[PDB]
Amino acid sequence: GGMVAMVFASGSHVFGGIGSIFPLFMMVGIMMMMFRGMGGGQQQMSRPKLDAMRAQFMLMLDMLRETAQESADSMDANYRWFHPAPNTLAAAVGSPRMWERKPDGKDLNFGVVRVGVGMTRPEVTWGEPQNMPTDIELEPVTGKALQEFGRYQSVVYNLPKMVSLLVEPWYALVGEREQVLGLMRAIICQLAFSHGPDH
C-alpha cells in the first residue's frame, strides 16, 4: 500500500483505471500464500497421504469381503442338498435321496421340515477391532465403510427356513384357508419324501 500511495502522491496517476489490476492480483496472491495452513515435518498429515491410507484401507477390506462370499457359497449348496424345493421332489422319487433321514442321534436333520425361504446368520464369527478410536477420533470415510459392512455382511439372504416337530406340542396356522392348507400340503409331501412310514 505504501508503494501505490507514493506513486499516486508523486503525480504519476499510471495505476488509475485498469492498471490497478496489477496491485489487485498481487494482493490476492499474497493472501493465499499466508492462508495455506499448517504443513510441517511432524505435521505430515495431508491429502496425499490420507488418501493413500484411505486407499490402502478400502483395498484390504475387499479381500475380507471375498473371504465371506467364498464361505457363503459353501452354505447355499449344502442346505439345498439337504432340503430341496417341493416341486423338485416329484422327479427325485426314484433317486436314493428319498427316505434318507435317520433317527439315530447323529442325524441332526431328523424332525426338521423345510417351510420356505428367508434370512439366516452365517457360520462366520467376526472379531471386534482392537484399539477402536472414540467417536470424535474416527475418520469419517472408514467409519461408515466398516459400519455398513457389518450390517449387510452379517446375514445371508434367500436361504431355506425350517420348523421342528420336536420343539412344540402344537403349531397354530393362522391365516386364510388357502395359505394354511397350501403350506400343510407342502409339509405333508416333504415329510413323506424324506421320512419313511417306519418313522
Binding site: 416341486n87 416329484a90 422319487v93 397350501g182 400340503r185 417306519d198
Partner: peptide, 18 residues
C-alpha cells in the same frame, strides 16, 4: 402346492415299498 400337484407327487410315491 395344489391338490393336483400333491396327488401327482402322492401317486409317484405310492409305487414304492421297503
Amino acid at each position: 402346492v395344489s391338490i393336483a400337484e400333491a396327488e401327482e407327487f402322492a401317486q409317484k410315491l405310492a409305487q414304492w415299498r421297503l
